[PDB]
Amino acid sequence: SCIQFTRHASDVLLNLNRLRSRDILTDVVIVVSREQFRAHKTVLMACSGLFYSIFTDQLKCNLSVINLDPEINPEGFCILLDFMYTSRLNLREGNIMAVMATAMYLQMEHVVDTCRKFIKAS
Amino acid sequence: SCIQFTRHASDVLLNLNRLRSRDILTDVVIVVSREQFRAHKTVLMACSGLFYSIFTDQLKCNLSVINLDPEINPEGFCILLDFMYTSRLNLREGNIMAVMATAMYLQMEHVVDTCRKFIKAS
């Protein structure tokens, strides 16, 4: 018999993104080639099957630095990290291949699905 | 020119609640009278003006235990913590006064607004 506040989840994610932009309570650095991205482990886990597996591991859960596979493109990662914190995906002709490959590696099934649909259309 | 995934914020919050139920990556205990509640500092901050102020404080940001004012009712807190992680508020005749008082203390303005509306109706 609960009541529900429709905008609550969106408002929570918006505030988590504000904490990320101000570097507040970030507890991990994701290294992609030369590039470094600060984030919250919980948000990464909530969005990615790969980070979920990494941070539930009794040894890796305690790491402050995570290095991604050298094939991962920093721009593709940046676009996906922005999507994690906003629900908005900056999908363009020039980045779609790098975004799909990064989403497959990160295990972000809904992003993989839209990339496959957008590629098929063209 | 981004695209948006409508269910992303809800799915993120659902996964954060799953991490909470399994006690994964929880980094704070909230003490309310004899009762203890484990949570994620980021989620508490995203939902509450009080926790936002506490965890942006250079000294308090590092505490693993936070004790609430002794006037705070553990059930009112439990109902509000559930709302933070689900968007669902278990508002009932027998708990509405304790929920409103706890929401005013936690600075959760949208919960305070619905409690004031439900009280006015009766």
């Binding site: 609960c2 009541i3 529900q4 506040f5 429709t6 | 669902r88 508020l89 619905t114």
Partner: peptide
């Protein structure tokens, strides 16, 4: 607020 809604009835979910």
């Amino acid at each position: 607020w809604v009835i979910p």
